[PDB]
């Protein structure tokens, strides 16, 4: 992927742990408590003022070397092409071609 | 079947009367790999056929089968651009397999309330030789006697 597209992801990770990990979660659980504040909360309104990129759902899983947003595998943090390349060199531990 | 010369798979006999011929029949009727519901239709048809024809459940099947059983059939062959129908004498094993297949197919094409009723009334029509299944042996006969010169 593009250098700018890779940079856009770093910003999306940095903002995700800054807000929506220790602050925005507190106002979302608060916007769910039925026992306290049923009309006057403003928490749904104050969640909007927070940066858009701060949401973890806005982050895209990309190949950690190439930046590829498609064909990703969470187990290796890589795309199918770079998974295969590392697999054939024996750089992925315990991984080999399987048959059954 | 070009080089490899294979035989035939010997199937287990009928769980009711120990007949291998009935086991071929239940399998021919069988659809979607539902053997339990396939023998249920064959036995209910045989129970309603023997009762309404004077017992002998195995023999009442054989009377209906003797009428649908073909003697000769045509084989499609292209010699010199033209398609010639060569009449060939059918083997005793396939004689029964075609007879059973046409009974099941003619009962499927019927308009009765159930498959057990459709099968029973098809076997009743075959025993007296006046149905869709006996006409399939009749059409096969007229086709063979026509191309009798190319035998």
């Amino acid at each position: 992927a593009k250098q700018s597209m890779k940079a856009r992801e770093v910003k999306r990770v940095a903002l995700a742990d800054k807000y929506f990990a220790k602050r925005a979660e507190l106002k979302a659980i608060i916007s769910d408590v039925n026992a306290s504040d049923e009309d006057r909360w403003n928490a749904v309104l104050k969640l909007q003022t927070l940066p858009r990129d701060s949401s973890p759902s806005r982050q895209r899983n990309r190949c950690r070397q190439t930046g590829r947003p498609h064909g990703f595998l969470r187990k290796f943090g890589l795309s199918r092409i770079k998974v295969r390349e590392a697999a054939m060199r024996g750089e992925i531990p315990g991984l080999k071609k399987a048959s059954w | 079947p070009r080089r490899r010369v294979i035989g035939q798979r010997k199937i287990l006999p009928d769980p009711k009367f120990g007949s291998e011929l009935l086991a071929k029949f239940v399998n021919i009727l069988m659809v979607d790999g539902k053997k339990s519901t396939a023998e249920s239709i064959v036995y209910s048809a045989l129970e309603t056929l023997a009762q309404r024809s004077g017992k002998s459940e195995l023999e009442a099947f054989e009377v209906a089968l003797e009428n649908v059983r073909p003697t000769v059939e045509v084989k499609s062959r292209r010699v010199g651009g033209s398609t010639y129908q060569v009449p060939v004498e059918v083997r005793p094993v396939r004689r029964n397999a075609l007879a059973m297949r046409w009974i099941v197919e003619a009962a499927r094409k019927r308009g009765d309330k159930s498959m057990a009723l459709r099968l029973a009334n098809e076997l009743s029509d075959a025993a007296e030789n006046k149905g869709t299944a006996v006409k399939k042996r009749e059409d096969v006969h007229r086709m063979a006697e026509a191309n009798k010169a190319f035998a």
Binding site: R80, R84, P93, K96 | -
Partner: protein, 99 residues
């Protein structure tokens, strides 16, 4: 009470060789040793497209076999505890100590 050792490794001829070390070290230094118990292997399978672009039917199929070994040592003798603690095991074998 009892000392439970759970062993994990991607190589089988490395897990039961490092398990052989634990079983022998404990039974020699005088301790009641249950096992080596061979628990089920967790086979994580992965299917990846082999071509950089198009060619859907052309694929590579891999697996990671996670071998499981259970070593239960009944007698927690000081001669056994100290012998097992200062043991040099294969770097690719994970050891879980359960009290």
């Amino acid at each position: 009470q009892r000392i439970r050792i759970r062993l994990k490794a991607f190589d089988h001829r490395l897990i039961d060789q490092a398990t052989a070390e634990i079983v022998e070290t404990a039974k020699r230094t005088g301790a009641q040793v249950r096992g080596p118990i061979p628990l089920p292997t967790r086979k994580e399978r992965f299917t990846v497209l082999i071509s950089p672009h198009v060619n859907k039917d052309a694929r590579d199929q891999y697996e990671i076999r996670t071998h499981l070994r259970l070593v239960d040592i009944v007698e927690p003798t000081e001669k056994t505890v100290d012998a097992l603690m200062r043991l040099d095991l294969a770097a690719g074998v994970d050891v879980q100590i359960s009290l």
